[PDB]
Amino acid sequence: EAAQSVDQLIKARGKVYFGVATDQNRLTTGKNAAIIQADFGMVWPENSMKWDATEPSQGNFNFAGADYLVNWAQQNGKLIGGGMLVWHSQLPSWVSSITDKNTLTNVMKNHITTLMTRYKGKIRAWDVVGEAFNEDGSLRQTVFLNVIGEDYIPIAFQTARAADPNAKLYIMDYNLDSASYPKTQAIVNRVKQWRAAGVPIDGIGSQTHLSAGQGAGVLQALPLLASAGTPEVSILMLDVAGASPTDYVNVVNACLNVQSCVGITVFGVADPDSTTPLLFDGNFNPKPAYNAIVQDLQQ
Protein backbone atom coordinates (compact mmCIF):
# COMPACT_ATOMS: atom_id res chain seq x y z
CA GLU A 1 0.00 0.00 0.00
CA ALA A 2 2.78 2.42 0.90
CA ALA A 3 4.47 1.82 -2.46
CA GLN A 4 1.43 3.43 -4.12
CA SER A 5 0.63 5.93 -1.34
CA VAL A 6 1.49 9.45 -2.44
CA ASP A 7 1.77 10.46 1.24
CA GLN A 8 4.26 7.74 2.15
CA LEU A 9 6.22 8.39 -1.05
CA ILE A 10 6.41 12.14 -0.55
CA LYS A 11 7.52 11.64 3.05
CA ALA A 12 10.30 9.42 1.71
CA ARG A 13 11.33 12.37 -0.48
CA GLY A 14 11.64 14.57 2.62
CA LYS A 15 8.27 16.32 2.73
CA VAL A 16 5.81 16.33 5.63
CA TYR A 17 2.63 15.07 3.96
CA PHE A 18 0.41 14.62 0.95
CA GLY A 19 -2.99 15.74 2.23
CA VAL A 20 -6.62 15.87 1.19
CA ALA A 21 -9.73 17.93 1.93
CA THR A 22 -12.62 15.89 3.32
CA ASP A 23 -15.36 15.86 5.98
CA GLN A 24 -17.90 13.44 7.52
CA ASN A 25 -20.05 13.25 4.39
CA ARG A 26 -17.15 11.94 2.30
CA LEU A 27 -15.68 9.77 5.03
CA THR A 28 -18.97 7.86 5.43
CA THR A 29 -19.63 7.23 1.73
CA GLY A 30 -18.05 5.51 -1.22
CA LYS A 31 -14.39 4.56 -0.82
CA ASN A 32 -13.20 7.92 0.50
CA ALA A 33 -12.15 6.79 3.97
CA ALA A 34 -10.24 3.76 2.68
CA ILE A 35 -8.43 5.87 0.07
CA ILE A 36 -7.54 8.54 2.62
CA GLN A 37 -6.28 5.98 5.13
CA ALA A 38 -4.02 4.51 2.47
CA ASP A 39 -2.87 7.47 0.43
CA PHE A 40 -3.02 10.73 2.45
CA GLY A 41 -1.20 11.79 5.60
CA MET A 42 -3.12 14.95 6.48
CA VAL A 43 -6.79 15.90 6.35
CA TRP A 44 -8.32 19.35 6.00
CA PRO A 45 -12.01 20.14 6.63
CA GLU A 46 -13.65 20.94 3.30
CA ASN A 47 -16.40 22.91 5.09
CA SER A 48 -16.84 21.94 8.75
CA MET A 49 -14.45 24.54 10.25
CA LYS A 50 -15.56 27.56 8.21
CA TRP A 51 -17.35 30.42 9.94
CA ASP A 52 -20.81 29.57 8.59
CA ALA A 53 -20.55 26.01 9.96
CA THR A 54 -18.96 26.81 13.30
CA GLU A 55 -20.52 30.15 14.40
CA PRO A 56 -23.76 30.68 12.45
CA SER A 57 -25.10 33.01 15.16
CA GLN A 58 -22.68 34.95 17.37
CA GLY A 59 -21.48 32.93 20.34
CA ASN A 60 -23.58 29.92 19.29
CA PHE A 61 -20.91 27.53 18.09
CA ASN A 62 -21.37 24.16 16.41
CA PHE A 63 -18.45 21.74 16.26
CA ALA A 64 -20.23 18.50 15.30
CA GLY A 65 -18.49 18.03 11.95
CA ALA A 66 -15.18 19.52 13.04
CA ASP A 67 -15.08 17.22 16.08
CA TYR A 68 -15.89 14.25 13.83
CA LEU A 69 -12.97 15.03 11.52
CA VAL A 70 -10.49 15.71 14.33
CA ASN A 71 -11.30 12.44 16.10
CA TRP A 72 -11.27 10.53 12.80
CA ALA A 73 -7.81 11.94 12.09
CA GLN A 74 -6.49 11.07 15.55
CA GLN A 75 -7.81 7.50 15.38
CA ASN A 76 -6.20 7.09 11.94
CA GLY A 77 -2.91 8.79 12.76
CA LYS A 78 -3.35 11.67 10.31
CA LEU A 79 -2.16 15.25 10.63
CA ILE A 80 -4.93 17.84 10.72
CA GLY A 81 -5.28 21.26 9.13
CA GLY A 82 -7.98 23.76 10.09
CA GLY A 83 -9.72 26.75 8.58
CA MET A 84 -10.67 29.12 7.24
CA LEU A 85 -10.72 31.38 10.31
CA VAL A 86 -11.11 34.78 8.56
CA TRP A 87 -12.72 34.80 5.10
CA HIS A 88 -15.24 37.01 3.33
CA SER A 89 -17.00 34.02 1.74
CA GLN A 90 -19.20 31.58 3.66
CA LEU A 91 -19.50 34.36 6.23
CA PRO A 92 -22.69 34.69 8.31
CA SER A 93 -24.84 37.74 7.80
CA TRP A 94 -24.48 38.67 11.48
CA VAL A 95 -20.78 39.28 10.88
CA SER A 96 -21.07 41.32 7.69
CA SER A 97 -23.77 43.48 9.34
CA ILE A 98 -21.29 44.80 11.93
CA THR A 99 -20.00 48.29 11.13
CA ASP A 100 -18.20 49.12 14.40
CA LYS A 101 -14.45 48.57 14.49
CA ASN A 102 -14.22 47.50 18.12
CA THR A 103 -17.18 45.13 17.79
CA LEU A 104 -15.86 43.38 14.70
CA THR A 105 -12.36 43.17 16.20
CA ASN A 106 -13.75 41.48 19.31
CA VAL A 107 -15.94 39.14 17.25
CA MET A 108 -13.09 38.14 14.96
CA LYS A 109 -10.74 37.55 17.87
CA ASN A 110 -13.31 35.44 19.68
CA HIS A 111 -14.00 33.39 16.56
CA ILE A 112 -10.29 32.70 16.05
CA THR A 113 -9.59 31.99 19.70
CA THR A 114 -12.58 29.74 20.27
CA LEU A 115 -11.89 27.45 17.29
CA MET A 116 -8.14 27.26 17.89
CA THR A 117 -8.40 26.67 21.65
CA ARG A 118 -10.91 23.85 21.18
CA TYR A 119 -8.32 21.83 19.23
CA LYS A 120 -5.20 23.26 20.90
CA GLY A 121 -2.11 21.19 20.17
CA LYS A 122 -3.89 18.89 17.71
CA ILE A 123 -3.70 21.04 14.55
CA ARG A 124 -0.59 21.20 12.40
CA ALA A 125 -1.60 24.33 10.50
CA TRP A 126 -4.44 26.82 10.38
CA ASP A 127 -5.60 28.90 7.43
CA VAL A 128 -5.96 32.09 9.43
CA VAL A 129 -6.72 34.54 6.60
CA GLY A 130 -7.82 33.55 3.12
CA GLU A 131 -8.38 35.40 -0.14
CA ALA A 132 -7.35 38.80 1.18
CA PHE A 133 -6.00 39.99 -2.20
CA ASN A 134 -7.61 41.32 -5.35
CA GLU A 135 -6.25 40.05 -8.67
CA ASP A 136 -4.23 43.26 -9.12
CA GLY A 137 -2.49 42.68 -5.77
CA SER A 138 -4.34 45.35 -3.81
CA LEU A 139 -6.16 44.23 -0.67
CA ARG A 140 -9.67 42.87 -1.22
CA GLN A 141 -12.35 45.19 0.19
CA THR A 142 -14.11 42.83 2.61
CA VAL A 143 -16.03 43.63 5.78
CA PHE A 144 -12.86 42.96 7.77
CA LEU A 145 -10.78 45.40 5.71
CA ASN A 146 -13.54 48.02 5.59
CA VAL A 147 -14.46 47.92 9.29
CA ILE A 148 -11.18 47.09 11.05
CA GLY A 149 -8.79 48.43 8.39
CA GLU A 150 -5.54 46.99 7.15
CA ASP A 151 -4.61 46.01 10.73
CA TYR A 152 -7.12 43.15 10.58
CA ILE A 153 -4.45 40.85 9.10
CA PRO A 154 -1.82 41.62 11.79
CA ILE A 155 -4.54 41.30 14.45
CA ALA A 156 -5.85 37.97 13.13
CA PHE A 157 -2.37 36.41 13.07
CA GLN A 158 -1.34 37.75 16.48
CA THR A 159 -4.61 36.45 17.95
CA ALA A 160 -4.14 33.04 16.34
CA ARG A 161 -0.56 32.69 17.60
CA ALA A 162 -1.71 33.39 21.16
CA ALA A 163 -4.56 30.89 20.97
CA ASP A 164 -2.35 27.99 19.84
CA PRO A 165 1.34 28.74 19.34
CA ASN A 166 1.92 25.11 18.28
CA ALA A 167 0.19 25.56 14.93
CA LYS A 168 1.69 26.91 11.73
CA LEU A 169 -0.29 30.03 10.76
CA TYR A 170 -1.03 30.45 7.08
CA ILE A 171 -2.30 33.11 4.75
CA MET A 172 -3.79 31.51 1.64
CA ASP A 173 -4.98 32.63 -1.73
CA TYR A 174 -5.80 31.43 -5.23
CA ASN A 175 -4.36 32.51 -8.58
CA LEU A 176 -0.83 32.38 -7.15
CA ASP A 177 0.07 29.83 -9.83
CA SER A 178 2.08 32.02 -12.20
CA ALA A 179 5.16 34.03 -11.31
CA SER A 180 3.94 36.64 -13.84
CA TYR A 181 0.48 37.24 -12.41
CA PRO A 182 0.38 40.47 -10.36
CA LYS A 183 -1.21 38.74 -7.36
CA THR A 184 1.77 36.44 -6.76
CA GLN A 185 4.42 39.13 -6.42
CA ALA A 186 2.00 41.29 -4.42
CA ILE A 187 1.35 38.70 -1.71
CA VAL A 188 5.10 38.11 -1.53
CA ASN A 189 5.79 41.80 -0.96
CA ARG A 190 3.03 42.25 1.61
CA VAL A 191 3.93 39.09 3.54
CA LYS A 192 7.58 40.17 3.59
CA GLN A 193 6.48 43.53 5.02
CA TRP A 194 4.08 42.01 7.57
CA ARG A 195 6.71 39.57 8.82
CA ALA A 196 9.27 42.37 9.15
CA ALA A 197 6.64 44.06 11.31
CA GLY A 198 6.53 41.01 13.57
CA VAL A 199 3.29 39.49 12.21
CA PRO A 200 3.45 35.70 12.76
CA ILE A 201 2.73 34.52 9.21
CA ASP A 202 4.35 31.09 9.15
CA GLY A 203 3.16 30.02 5.72
CA ILE A 204 1.76 30.96 2.36
CA GLY A 205 -0.74 28.38 1.13
CA SER A 206 -1.37 28.42 -2.61
CA GLN A 207 -4.77 27.00 -3.52
CA THR A 208 -3.70 25.86 -7.01
CA HIS A 209 -6.99 25.52 -8.93
CA LEU A 210 -5.35 24.97 -12.29
CA SER A 211 -6.59 24.97 -15.84
CA ALA A 212 -4.92 22.72 -18.39
CA GLY A 213 -1.24 23.48 -18.90
CA GLN A 214 -0.87 25.71 -15.84
CA GLY A 215 1.25 23.22 -13.91
CA ALA A 216 4.36 24.46 -15.72
CA GLY A 217 3.85 27.91 -14.21
CA VAL A 218 3.81 26.55 -10.67
CA LEU A 219 7.45 25.52 -11.13
CA GLN A 220 8.26 29.27 -11.16
CA ALA A 221 5.49 30.61 -8.93
CA LEU A 222 6.21 28.42 -5.91
CA PRO A 223 9.88 29.50 -5.63
CA LEU A 224 8.69 33.10 -5.94
CA LEU A 225 6.21 32.54 -3.10
CA ALA A 226 9.01 31.00 -1.03
CA SER A 227 11.05 34.17 -1.55
CA ALA A 228 8.73 35.97 0.88
CA GLY A 229 10.77 34.25 3.58
CA THR A 230 7.99 32.46 5.41
CA PRO A 231 8.98 29.32 7.34
CA GLU A 232 6.78 27.25 5.03
CA VAL A 233 4.87 27.27 1.79
CA SER A 234 2.37 24.71 0.59
CA ILE A 235 -0.03 23.65 -2.15
CA LEU A 236 -3.36 23.79 -0.37
CA MET A 237 -6.42 22.99 -2.54
CA LEU A 238 -5.08 21.33 -5.64
CA ASP A 239 -7.23 20.35 -8.60
CA VAL A 240 -6.51 20.44 -12.33
CA ALA A 241 -9.04 20.81 -15.13
CA GLY A 242 -8.42 17.89 -17.49
CA ALA A 243 -6.34 16.13 -14.80
CA SER A 244 -3.31 15.84 -17.04
CA PRO A 245 -0.41 13.86 -15.57
CA THR A 246 1.81 16.65 -16.91
CA ASP A 247 0.07 19.32 -14.81
CA TYR A 248 -0.07 17.18 -11.67
CA VAL A 249 3.58 16.07 -11.88
CA ASN A 250 4.68 19.66 -12.42
CA VAL A 251 2.90 20.77 -9.22
CA VAL A 252 4.53 17.93 -7.29
CA ASN A 253 7.96 18.81 -8.71
CA ALA A 254 7.46 22.47 -7.80
CA CYS A 255 7.04 21.45 -4.17
CA LEU A 256 9.98 19.02 -4.35
CA ASN A 257 12.15 21.83 -5.75
CA VAL A 258 11.31 24.28 -2.92
CA GLN A 259 12.98 23.55 0.41
CA SER A 260 10.30 25.34 2.43
CA CYS A 261 7.41 23.54 0.71
CA VAL A 262 6.13 21.15 3.37
CA GLY A 263 3.52 19.35 1.31
CA ILE A 264 0.58 19.24 -1.06
CA THR A 265 -3.16 18.90 -0.37
CA VAL A 266 -5.59 17.80 -3.09
CA PHE A 267 -9.10 19.25 -2.99
CA GLY A 268 -11.05 16.03 -2.51
CA VAL A 269 -10.83 12.40 -3.61
CA ALA A 270 -13.17 11.55 -6.51
CA ASP A 271 -14.21 13.64 -9.52
CA PRO A 272 -18.01 13.84 -8.89
CA ASP A 273 -17.24 15.50 -5.52
CA SER A 274 -14.88 18.19 -6.84
CA THR A 275 -13.78 19.34 -15.50
CA THR A 276 -12.96 15.90 -14.02
CA PRO A 277 -10.04 17.49 -12.14
CA LEU A 278 -9.18 15.09 -9.28
CA LEU A 279 -6.93 12.02 -8.90
CA PHE A 280 -9.69 9.38 -8.57
CA ASP A 281 -12.63 8.75 -10.90
CA GLY A 282 -16.28 8.23 -10.02
CA ASN A 283 -15.61 4.50 -9.45
CA PHE A 284 -12.91 5.55 -6.94
CA ASN A 285 -10.18 4.11 -9.12
CA PRO A 286 -6.88 5.99 -9.45
CA LYS A 287 -6.54 8.04 -12.62
CA PRO A 288 -3.43 8.33 -14.81
CA ALA A 289 -2.36 11.44 -12.91
CA TYR A 290 -2.36 9.52 -9.61
CA ASN A 291 -0.14 6.82 -11.11
CA ALA A 292 2.15 9.51 -12.55
CA ILE A 293 2.63 11.19 -9.16
CA VAL A 294 3.48 7.82 -7.62
CA GLN A 295 6.04 7.16 -10.35
CA ASP A 296 7.54 10.64 -10.02
CA LEU A 297 7.96 10.24 -6.26
CA GLN A 298 9.32 6.69 -6.28
CA GLN A 299 13.10 6.36 -6.11
Residue numbers in the entry: 1 to 274, 279 to 303
Manuscript excerpt for this entry:
Here, we investigate the molecular origins of the nearly billionfold rate enhancement achieved by directed evolution of the computationally designed Kemp eliminase HG3 (7). The Kemp elimination is a well-studied model for proton transfer from carbon that has served as a benchmark for de novo design. Although the first-generation HG3 design is significantly more efficient than an “off-the-shelf” catalyst like bovine serum albumin, its specific activity was further increased 200-fold over 17 rounds of mutagenesis and screening. All HG3 variants have an inactive conformational sub-state, rooted in the original protein scaffold, which was gradually supplanted with a catalytically competent sub-state as evolution progressed.
Cryogenic structures of HG3 and HG3.7 in the absence of a ligand revealed that β-strands 6 and 7 (located adjacent to the binding pocket), adopt two distinct backbone conformations whereas only a single conformer is observed for HG3.17. One conformation matches that seen in the corresponding complexes with a transition-state analog (TSA), and presumably represents the active sub-state. In the inactive sub-state, however, a backbone flip creates a steric clash between the carbonyl group of Leu236 and the nitro group of the TSA that would block ligand binding. Estimating the respective populations from the volumes of duplicated cross peaks shows that the inactive species comprises ~25% of the HG3 and HG3.7 samples at 25 °C, but only 5% of HG3.17. Although conformational selection has been observed in the optimization of other designed enzymes, including Kemp eliminases, what is striking in the HG3 system is that the active conformational sub-state was not explicitly engineered into the xylanase scaffold but only emerged upon introduction of the 11 design mutations due to a serendipitous backbone flip. Instead, design created two “energetically frustrated” enzyme conformations.
